[PDB]
Amino acid sequence: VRYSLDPENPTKSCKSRGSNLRVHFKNTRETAQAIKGMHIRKATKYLKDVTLQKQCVPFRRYNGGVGRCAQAKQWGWTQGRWPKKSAEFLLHMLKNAESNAELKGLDVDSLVIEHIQVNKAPKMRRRTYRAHGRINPYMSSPCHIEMILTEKE
Amino acid sequence: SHRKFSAPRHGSLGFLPRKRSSRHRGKVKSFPKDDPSKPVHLTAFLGYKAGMTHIVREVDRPGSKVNKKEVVEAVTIVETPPMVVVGIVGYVETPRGLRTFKTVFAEHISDECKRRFYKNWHKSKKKAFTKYCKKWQDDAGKRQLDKDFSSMKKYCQVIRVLAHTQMRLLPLRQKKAHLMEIQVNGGTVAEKLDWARERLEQQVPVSQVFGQDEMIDVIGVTKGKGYKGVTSRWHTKKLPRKTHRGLRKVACIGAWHPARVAFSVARAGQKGYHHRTEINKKIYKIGQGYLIKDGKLIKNNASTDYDLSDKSINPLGGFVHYGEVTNDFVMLKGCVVGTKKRVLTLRKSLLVQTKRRALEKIDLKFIDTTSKFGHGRFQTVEEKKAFMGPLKKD
Amino acid sequence: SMLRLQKRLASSVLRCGKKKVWLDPNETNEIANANSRQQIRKLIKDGLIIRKPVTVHSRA
Amino acid sequence: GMWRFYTEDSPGLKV
RNA sequence: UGGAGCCGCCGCAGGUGCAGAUCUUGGUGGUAGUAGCAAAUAUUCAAACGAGAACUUUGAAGGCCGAAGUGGAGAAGGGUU
RNA sequence: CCUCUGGCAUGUUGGAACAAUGUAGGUAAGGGAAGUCGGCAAGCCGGAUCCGUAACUUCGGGAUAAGGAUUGGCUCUAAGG
RNA sequence: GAAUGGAUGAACGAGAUUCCCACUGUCCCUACCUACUAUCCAGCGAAACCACAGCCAAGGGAACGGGCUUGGCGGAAUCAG
RNA sequence: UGUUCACCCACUAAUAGGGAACGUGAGCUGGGUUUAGACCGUCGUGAGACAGGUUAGUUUUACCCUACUGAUGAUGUGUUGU
Ligand SMILES: [Mg+2]
Ligand SMILES: [Mg+2]
Ligand SMILES: [Mg+2]
Ligand SMILES: [Mg+2]
Ligand SMILES: [Mg+2]
Ligand SMILES: [Mg+2]
Ligand SMILES: [Mg+2]
Ligand SMILES: [Mg+2]
Ligand SMILES: [Mg+2]
Ligand SMILES: [Mg+2]
Ligand SMILES: [Mg+2]
Ligand SMILES: [Mg+2]
Ligand SMILES: [Mg+2]
Ligand SMILES: [Mg+2]
Ligand SMILES: [Mg+2]
Ligand SMILES: [Mg+2]
Ligand SMILES: [Mg+2]
Ligand SMILES: [Mg+2]
Ligand SMILES: [Mg+2]
Ligand SMILES: [Mg+2]
Ligand SMILES: [Mg+2]
Ligand SMILES: [Mg+2]
Ligand SMILES: [Mg+2]
Ligand SMILES: [Mg+2]
Ligand SMILES: [Mg+2]
Ligand SMILES: [Mg+2]
Ligand SMILES: [Mg+2]
Ligand SMILES: [Mg+2]
């Protein structure tokens, strides 16, 4: 398929996407901003730290009510969280793009995450029963992720 | 309409932003006015709140019902091991204010002091004042040093010494010794500066600053109490039992029509850990620390002319949440700001003291030395060993 | 692996609660392929599933 | 929709 | 971009031009990763399975319902649970 | 209220903290309703045995009126078939 | 004001008052403790409301302005209240 | 006394007077006014009436913006600490 923002030198730029993933769009977005521009081996480390809370993902855009944390000071920011599902869902994606580099025949530990982008995916809906017999929505806001790595060292 | 029944308002506005103090070490916001006439001296000291206790004393205010009657009296022990002067720092008057002009540091500086200059000492290579101290042993540096001191002689007006604590000698956890600027108040600036230039790298004990029966101002940070509601933080009335949305509140924040809530209205926020300068705390006892001529001299602390035992101010089982006061200490009347272990600035008074009460000579009759770690009933361990007799642990 | 069925059948064979059914946790897999009763009655006789004793309530 | 008030409460009562 | 029809002029005809109607139907935001997932005392250790275990299962312990039961059976109602 | 038989996994989640406000419990020196529209709320009282029981009365009641004392553990005695 | 019933009245009342005894955090005057919250985190995740928006003083003005006039002034993004 | 108001006792230095949407109900309370239930008086043929008396009667929502309270931070100074 067409990715937004096609690569500069396709020769040496592996690809990935994962469509229609049950991962909070907003959390997935912030952790995708965090990861962006990293060398793939750093990125992986960074997400496993986020998984165990040794580093945070600063929640910059979608930061309404999100707590402060000392770990955010690394990023130059006050907010920050440890979104685990998001890190588990773009550690799989990284795995796949790394897969495809290896298949394509690129140096895997020269790969920079050049482009990554979280879109909203069509919403699910299940209901929540409310006071005075009102029935409100209770909808997941899943996300399409996609990304592009590149040989840069 | 007017408020029906008048009442004075809760809390003082002369104390607010009721926020958590930036500093931990309480700043001396004003040193006394150096008359140029009396000889040079230090105006301030830096102690530590070790703990409270009793005293007993004959009082001599004639007229009172308590004249020639032994009262008891609470007191704070401020353990005050001698400070080390490691600097001077010249100031000059301007119409803008009082600009710092030139800071000359000493040659050798302790790791007690050097600690302060790094946020993480474990991780540092401890490289501070390293290229500085090169100055103190050559022709070039020593000359520049002298020219700096000369310039300060020409230009400066206020001179403050920089000293720091001897964190080494305390029962506290921390090693990072508190520095502080202390002002030299006395004769002419050239005399004033050559005094502090002589004192450089040297000890300064408490008795050199203060004397007995002297009113001094304690400066420190208050014992902090976190987020607190308006009823705690402002001592507002509680509302009654029936109040539906809670009752440790203020009911009417404000009127409608200055349509903003005013700065004078009581709100919940930080209670405690404020900076506060309590004044007129009379020194009952400047106490000599433990020392050795052949054996220990532990007596010299809490023994009085009338008691004559072998105590120190340390109670049985020590001062609680603190340690042993093994160093020289002052003994103020009454409570003072802050917690146990808190660093505490003393300061000579801003004020011409000439009240009957402020010139009163204190002869102590008896220092209570019973444990504070429970209801104590024995003044010393030897007394306890006498009273009890032998125990199964023998 | 999953022995809620074997505990039910065992209980019904023993005519006890299923509190009182004890399945040997070491020999689990043998119990797992017990599906029928009479397979279970066999395991009752072999001593892999056993009726526990009553919790003692002394009258003393 | 949201309940808000009872029938005999009729919020802003000004008789 | 798309992939099969469409327009100019002269006449005739009309269910012919929207920002509003607490307008109708459909969709989407900010609010917000916020409120919230607090009734009824309680969980812990090891193992098994398994890609994966705070939650499954087994064993061990600690707890509750305390025979007006959180037990054992029906009526009505459900309709394959 | 505690237990066996039988039954459950704390009622749609977990973890870390222990701030203000709350919801639900408790306790408070001296005073004792001064609080408030109003003793609202909570507190006192409480079982049993033994005494003792007013006004009034439709003579039945009032009446657990009020007001008092005792109560455990242990070792015996006497009395009831 | 006399079966539109008048006067009475023991017993009874989750009925309306007043006083006394007791008792108490109702109060003087507030304080400390416990549990569940709120708090921070993982997972999950609504709603009302919404012309645009959101610092003030005064003026005039449909005679009480966030916006206008004249002044004061104005510093990202946020957290708990 | 629901009261505003009023009056009385007591203390006191003094027990001055007002304003802020007759300040202040997403601050309370709800005693009183002011639904529906009922009683009494007067009025009405009556249904009903009464600034005439009585008793019983659901007091919702803040997570938005501001304001205030406290809490991280912000631009600058080359970075950092004092
Ligand atoms: Mg619901
Ligand atoms: Mg319903
Ligand atoms: Mg006044
Ligand atoms: Mg209420
Ligand atoms: Mg003590
Ligand atoms: Mg076609
Ligand atoms: Mg038509
Ligand atoms: Mg339209
Ligand atoms: Mg939450
Ligand atoms: Mg059954
Ligand atoms: Mg529970
Ligand atoms: Mg559970
Ligand atoms: Mg349930
Ligand atoms: Mg009390
Ligand atoms: Mg009163
Ligand atoms: Mg009263
Ligand atoms: Mg009551
Ligand atoms: Mg009676
Ligand atoms: Mg008549
Ligand atoms: Mg008649
Ligand atoms: Mg009549
Ligand atoms: Mg407006
Ligand atoms: Mg008003
Ligand atoms: Mg209001
Ligand atoms: Mg209200
Ligand atoms: Mg009422
Ligand atoms: Mg009515
Ligand atoms: Mg919140």
Side-chain angles (χ1 to χ4, degrees), chain A, chain B residues 1-138 140-141 145 148-394, chain C, chain D:
Chain A
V1 284
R2 292 273 314 291
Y3 293 3
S4 27
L5 184 69
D6 299 46
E8 194 195 54
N9 42 337
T11 325
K12 50 201 289 184
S13 286
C14 61
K15 273 182 167 176
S16 54
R17 50 162 43 208
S19 287
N20 210 338
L21 318 182
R22 273 168 153 275
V23 206
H24 283 20
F25 168 72
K26 290 189 175 153
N27 307 151
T28 322
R29 187 263 165 176
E30 301 294 46
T31 196
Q33 279 304 268
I35 213 172
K36 185 179 70 170
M38 285 194 201
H39 173 245
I40 194 175
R41 302 312 185 84
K42 189 171 181 273
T44 51
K45 207 195 304 184
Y46 171 68
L47 298 175
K48 292 181 196 289
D49 290 23
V50 166
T51 307
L52 307 190
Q53 321 219 354
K54 301 268 80 174
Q55 294 186 284
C56 93
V57 171
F59 272 34
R60 303 181 139 105
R61 173 164 289 142
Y62 303 119
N63 80 315
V66 173
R68 286 91 135 278
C69 62
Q71 299 201 338
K73 293 189 290 184
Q74 291 175 321
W75 297 96
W77 207 240
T78 72
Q79 266 76 82
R81 262 185 191 172
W82 295 272
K84 191 177 141 76
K85 260 253 271 286
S86 291
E88 295 293 330
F89 268 67
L90 38 67
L91 230 8
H92 275 97
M93 200 152 294
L94 263 58
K95 228 76 173 180
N96 209 342
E98 169 261 37
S99 131
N100 302 325
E102 202 152 45
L103 191 145
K104 229 136 170 277
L106 313 187
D107 185 28
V108 174
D109 61 312
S110 66
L111 292 171
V112 172
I113 176 155
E114 173 53 33
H115 163 74
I116 181 164
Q117 142 157 40
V118 183
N119 263 321
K120 296 184 218 194
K123 296 216 179 182
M124 306 301 288
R125 78 165 47 192
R126 33 105 142 76
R127 74 235 236 90
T128 175
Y129 297 103
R130 294 195 87 93
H132 311 271
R134 300 193 316 102
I135 294 190
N136 295 21
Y138 200 91
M139 300 211 295
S140 177
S141 296
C143 76
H144 308 288
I145 310 172
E146 63 123 337
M147 27 164 294
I148 285 170
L149 320 181
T150 297
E151 286 197 86
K152 282 156 76 83
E153 220 187 356
Chain B
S1 73
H2 69 93
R3 180 225 269 243
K4 288 197 87 171
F5 283 26
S6 76
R9 88 72 132 299
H10 303 272
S12 157
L13 289 173
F15 277 117
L16 44 61
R18 292 253 245 187
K19 76 197 248 189
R20 230 157 23 191
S21 184
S22 34
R23 70 221 84 196
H24 185 114
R25 171 178 62 91
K27 177 184 279 287
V28 180
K29 295 266 192 66
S30 246
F31 294 101
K33 298 319 302 279
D34 55 319
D35 47 348
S37 59
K38 69 180 62 259
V40 300
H41 42 75
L42 256 39
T43 54
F45 209 78
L46 202 58
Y48 295 90
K49 169 159 170 148
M52 283 275 230
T53 180
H54 307 123
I55 234 60
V56 172
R57 58 181 206 83
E58 274 283 79
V59 197
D60 219 64
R61 76 273 283 266
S64 65
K65 239 196 297 96
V66 92
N67 189 219
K68 295 153 184 161
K69 307 299 185 196
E70 295 180 22
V71 310
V72 320
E73 220 77 280
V75 286
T76 43
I77 276 66
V78 191
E79 180 175 352
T80 36
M83 284 203 277
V84 174
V85 186
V86 297
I88 59 95
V89 38
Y91 287 89
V92 57
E93 269 90 83
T94 84
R96 272 121 72 78
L98 204 266
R99 210 182 96 259
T100 156
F101 175 76
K102 195 89 285 203
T103 308
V104 174
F105 263 89
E107 170 165 13
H108 310 292
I109 296 164
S110 178
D111 282 5
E112 289 160 30
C113 208
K114 293 254 282 293
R115 243 57 143 73
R116 184 127 303 286
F117 300 91
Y118 306 79
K119 258 59 179 63
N120 182 341
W121 174 265
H122 178 55
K123 211 82 82 154
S124 73
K125 313 296 181 54
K126 308 145 186 77
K127 295 277 285 133
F129 288 85
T130 44
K131 296 156 167 189
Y132 188 76
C133 70
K134 262 36 262 143
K135 286 190 179 174
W136 286 87
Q137 57 282 162
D138 43 22
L145 269 261
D148 290 7
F149 280 117
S150 290
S151 199
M152 290 181 65
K153 169 188 293 65
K154 282 190 194 177
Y155 293 87
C156 290
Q157 334 270 22
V158 166
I159 271 170
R160 309 222 187 89
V161 114
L162 292 174
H164 73 99
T165 55
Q166 217 151 185
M167 223 71 215
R168 177 162 50 94
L169 312 176
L170 290 164
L172 279 28
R173 197 212 199 186
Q174 70 161 231
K175 297 153 199 183
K176 185 193 284 168
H178 298 109
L179 282 86
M180 157 164 163
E181 273 190 41
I182 312 167
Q183 200 174 309
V184 186
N185 286 5
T188 191
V189 173
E191 178 176 358
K192 195 178 292 210
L193 190 35
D194 269 309
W195 181 83
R197 191 157 144 73
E198 187 179 44
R199 295 281 168 287
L200 216 29
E201 310 175 303
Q202 220 80 312
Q203 298 289 323
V204 178
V206 201
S207 66
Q208 302 284 49
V209 177
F210 302 106
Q212 220 209 301
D213 35 282
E214 195 206 319
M215 310 314 305
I216 68 167
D217 305 350
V218 184
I219 299 158
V221 170
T222 302
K223 190 166 59 155
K225 330 193 151 292
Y227 218 140
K228 276 282 168 283
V230 77
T231 275
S232 316
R233 185 158 108 120
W234 295 102
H235 304 85
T236 58
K237 208 83 200 154
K238 306 227 299 183
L239 292 328
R241 198 191 53 72
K242 296 178 72 149
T243 8
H244 155 47
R245 303 156 207 285
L247 45 60
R248 287 171 125 282
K249 310 174 78 61
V250 176
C252 175
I253 286 179
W256 194 321
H257 230 87
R260 275 88 100 276
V261 8
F263 84 104
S264 53
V265 187
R267 322 296 253 110
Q270 172 63 40
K271 171 151 160 89
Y273 206 77
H274 303 327
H275 188 222
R276 297 290 188 251
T277 299
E278 181 98 298
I279 82 186
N280 295 14
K281 316 302 281 196
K282 191 159 207 69
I283 300 159
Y284 284 180
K285 192 186 173 59
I286 284 157
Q288 169 168 31
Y290 299 0
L291 67 156
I292 317 181
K293 54 178 64 259
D294 295 303
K296 274 278 173 189
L297 289 185
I298 215 166
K299 292 141 177 175
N300 287 52
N301 308 43
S303 160
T304 70
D305 55 356
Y306 315 133
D307 197 308
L308 51 148
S309 185
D310 67 301
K311 318 214 225 85
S312 50
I313 24 64
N314 287 308
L316 297 204
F319 286 100
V320 176
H321 286 111
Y322 184 77
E324 272 192 75
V325 178
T326 58
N327 300 299
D328 31 20
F329 61 97
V330 302
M331 214 187 65
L332 279 21
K333 189 198 191 182
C335 58
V336 310
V337 72
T339 153
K340 304 292 180 291
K341 314 178 180 76
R342 185 149 285 164
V343 68
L344 225 62
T345 296
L346 286 46
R347 178 190 74 187
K348 298 183 107 298
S349 202
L350 274 279
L351 216 186
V352 172
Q353 235 71 56
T354 314
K355 294 261 68 263
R356 212 102 144 184
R357 201 157 172 175
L359 301 175
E360 193 179 310
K361 301 203 93 288
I362 288 94
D363 201 303
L364 300 183
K365 307 266 276 86
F366 178 79
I367 302 212
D368 176 19
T369 48
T370 207
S371 184
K372 314 299 174 215
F373 191 44
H375 287 109
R377 61 181 76 110
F378 296 119
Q379 291 300 313
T380 165
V381 185
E382 58 106 301
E383 173 182 317
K384 187 168 184 202
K385 292 281 276 283
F387 186 91
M388 299 294 291
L391 283 299
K392 197 213 192 103
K393 50 169 165 60
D394 278 292
Chain C
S1 45
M2 154 47 76
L3 304 172
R4 93 202 318 162
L5 178 277
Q6 281 74 3
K7 195 184 256 63
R8 159 166 74 70
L9 255 5
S11 159
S12 190
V13 179
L14 279 14
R15 315 217 215 80
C16 80
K18 95 169 79 69
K19 288 214 296 193
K20 269 55 187 146
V21 169
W22 174 86
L23 308 185
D24 187 49
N26 287 11
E27 307 204 0
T28 294
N29 306 317
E30 290 86 290
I31 295 175
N33 59 255
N35 59 349
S36 80
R37 44 159 76 79
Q38 101 131 326
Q39 231 104 257
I40 272 150
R41 216 159 309 105
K42 144 102 298 92
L43 298 196
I44 288 160
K45 92 142 288 187
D46 290 354
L48 311 187
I49 104 84
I50 308 175
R51 198 212 231 83
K52 280 147 82 172
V54 179
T55 311
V56 303
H57 182 207
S58 169
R59 189 66 171 67
Chain D
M2 270 184 66
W3 158 76
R4 311 294 175 158
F5 51 76
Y6 288 124
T7 310
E8 305 295 72
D9 200 10
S10 222
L13 201 72
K14 271 257 282 172
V15 166

